[model samples]
Target: SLPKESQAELQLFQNEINAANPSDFLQFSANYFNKRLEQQRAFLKAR
Candidate 1:
């Protein structure tokens, strides 16, 4: 099994997948996390 943090990350990713219902998981996940990275970058900028 993964470490606790990895498990938590997987669970959260699963929640995203469930909400999104995408036909292509790879495409969806790439776009999703890339957008998240940009959003988090902006968040740090705001901070």
Candidate 2:
């Protein structure tokens, strides 16, 4: 089960992605957490 706050986000995300396709949702929706986590990352050092 998802957390209370994430529950709504997942539904909204899934709905936005239209991932009801033969369970393609697995690969399609997987990135949400990755880019979602990207929001937490900051600019890189002077490289």
Candidate 3:
């Protein structure tokens, strides 16, 4: 056997995977916010 390790770890991820029976959106993707944060980071780093 192994030293007891997990197949995968979800520090900040979904705990389950179910079909979208009712709607299409399962979870919200922070594309806009992420881009904004990156843009802010670039702004901070850029001279």
Candidate 4:
């Protein structure tokens, strides 16, 4: 199950990407990069 905050953030980011006028590839790349960073932090915290 997803945490409420994560779910909310995901929705917000999704909407932002959908509505963005800039390059889709660039936006997707940035989003993936940020998400990976978040996952890394979570993994370190779990140790």
RMSD of each: 2.1, 4.6, 8.3, 4.8
- Highest TM-score: give the candidate number: 1
lDDT, residue 24, model 3: 32
Selected candidate, larger TM-score, 1 vs 2: 1
Q: What's the candidate order when arranged by decreasing lDDT?
A: 1, 4, 2, 3
- TM-score to native of every candidate shown: 0.64, 0.43, 0.35, 0.47
The lDDT of each candidate is 0.89, 0.68, 0.41, 0.76
State the lDDT of candidate 1 residue by residue for 1-47, as single tens digits: 89997798789889999998999999999998898789879979994
How far off is residue 42 in model 3, in Å?
0.8
User: Compared with the true structure, what per-residue lDDT tens digits does model 3 show for residues 1-47?
Assistant: 32322323221223332322224333333443365468779879988
Please report the candidate that would top lDDT against the real structure: 1
Candidate 1 clashing pairs? none
Clashes of each: 0, 0, 0, 0
Poorly placed runs, candidate 2 (over 4 Å): 1-4, 19-23, 43-47
Candidate 2 residue 14 C-alpha distance from true site, Å:
2.0
Query: How does residue 7 of candidate 2 score in lDDT?
Result: 93
How far residue 12's Cα lies from its native spot in candidate 1, in Å, is 2.6
